[PDB]
Structures are given as structure tokens and as C-alpha cells.
Design a protein around this ligand. Structure first.
Ligand SMILES: OC[C@H]1O[C@@H](O)[C@H](O)[C@@H](O)[C@H]1O
Ligand SMILES: [Ca+2]
Length: 141
């Protein structure tokens, strides 16, 4: 029910491959957002912010890792909510297992128009923290 109308990111890759932030919001597990890795690489801090079409009561973020590589797989996160897009309130901080499984970050119900996923840690095939990727990210109530 919470519907993402817009997604913005710290950075995105569109030169070395086509991996824009919108690819984290397109319902397709075969497309991923990637932080900019082509020179000059953006090495963080990485984040993804979802703008919803209304204020929703939310209690879960789904984070589906890219399925073809561990590059940018998020292992450390903060989730924050906002009504205006500038003033955020942290609702959850934690770690995520280093595997390709869809992750479900759960917290007490809270109103949000914007949901920001800040990366505090990530892994790579090779590395830590340099990249961030997501096949899909969305929010649920
Ligand atoms: O160096 C970063 C890059 O590494 C590549 O091997 C991978 O195909 C890209 O998606 C990107 O993660
Ligand atoms: Ca996708």
C-alpha cells in the first residue's frame, strides 16, 4: 500500500553500467541500483531515500540484495523517517547477514512520507563500505 513515487540516492552508476536509483523501485529483481563506482567513484556515505505518495503508517523495510554479486550488499544500516524530507528521525539501526536473502527490517509502527536507508557497512566480492547496491527496496505497514 505505501507506494514509492520517487527514489533518490547518495549517488548512482549510469556510465559503467545502467544502475540508477530508480532500479531499486521497479519491482524487478534483475535490476539493481549501484552507488557510482566508475571513476570518480562515490565511496560514501551511501543512502537511498524513498518518497511515498502520502503519509503512511509503516513498520517494515524490505531490502532485497543484488542477486549476481555481493558488491555493495548492505550489512550495516540505519532507517530514518521524515514527513518533510529534511528533518529525519531514526527508527532502527542494525546489522544484516552477509547472504543474498531478502532482508526485512522491522520496527514499531510510525508515520512516514520519506524513508531513508543509510548504509553504515557493506561487503564486496574483493572493499568494505566502498559500494552500495539494492535490487529492490520498499516499505510496508
Ligand atoms: O567495482 C564495482 C563493480 O564490480 C563489477 O564486477 C560488477 O559487475 C559491477 O556491478 C560493480 O559492482
Ligand atoms: Ca530492481
Amino acid at each position: 500500500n505505501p507506494r514509492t513515487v520517487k527514489i533518490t540516492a547518495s549517488s548512482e552508476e549510469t556510465s559503467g553500467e545502467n544502475a540508477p536509483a530508480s532500479f531499486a523501485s521497479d519491482g524487478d529483481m534483475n535490476t539493481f541500483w549501484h552507488s557510482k563506482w566508475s571513476s570518480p567513484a562515490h565511496e560514501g556515505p551511501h543512502h537511498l531515500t524513498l518518497e511515498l505518495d502520502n503519509v503512511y503508517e509503516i513498520n517494515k523495510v524490505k531490502y532485497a540484495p543484488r542477486q549476481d554479486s555481493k558488491n555493495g550488499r548492505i550489512t550495516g544500516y540505519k532507517v530514518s523517517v521524515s514527513l518533510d524530507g529534511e528533518n529525519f528521525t531514526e527508527v532502527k539501526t542494525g546489522t544484516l547477514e552477509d547472504n543474498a536473502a531478502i532482508k526485512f527490517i522491522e520496527f514499531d509502527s510510525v508515520d512516514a512520507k520519506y524513508v531513508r536507508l543509510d548504509v553504515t557497512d557493506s561487503v564486496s566480492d574483493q572493499g568494505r563500505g566502498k559500494f552500495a547496491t539494492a535490487a529492490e527496496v520498499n516499505v510496508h505497514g
